[PDB]
Amino acid sequence: VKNKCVNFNFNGLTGTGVLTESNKKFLPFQQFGRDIADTTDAVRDPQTL
């Protein structure tokens, strides 16, 4: 579910947030994004890339 406060567990990452489709373009190897303060902000969906 997108655009909704949903508790999410990605690859066993876990946490609660609002998941929205992102314009930032990951490099092929990268999997988990991070912020300036090193907080998980972007996650790459396993089943569908």
Binding site: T14, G15, A37, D38
Partner: protein, 96 residues
């Protein structure tokens, strides 16, 4: 004569402000010191404080309370001092 000196004087203020930012340094430091102090506060979250993981949800997820307590109690003591030191920084700066 006085008017012309006064009018030219104001004009000189524009150029010193327009070109050089070093004059306005004092205001910038309050922003820099403060904004920096937050970054130290936020970065502390990513510190283990002698525990298995810095991320709280990880410790909740992998291990159950009776032993999880010892892990979490270390995080709280670590973060709490970090919070306390940050506030005591602010109170000192606020008086200044």
């Amino acid at each position: 004569l006085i008017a012309n000196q006064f009018n030219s004087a104001i004009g000189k203020i524009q150029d010193s402000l327009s070109s050089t930012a070093s004059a306005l340094g004092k205001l910038q430091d309050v922003v820099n010191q403060n904004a920096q102090a937050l970054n130290t506060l936020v970065k502390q979250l990513s510190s283990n404080f002698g525990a298995i993981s810095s991320v709280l949800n990880d410790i909740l997820s992998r291990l159950d309370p009776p032993e999880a307590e010892v892990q979490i109690d270390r995080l709280i003591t670590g973060r709490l001092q970090s919070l306390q030191t940050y506030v005591t920084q602010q109170l000192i700066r606020a008086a200044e």
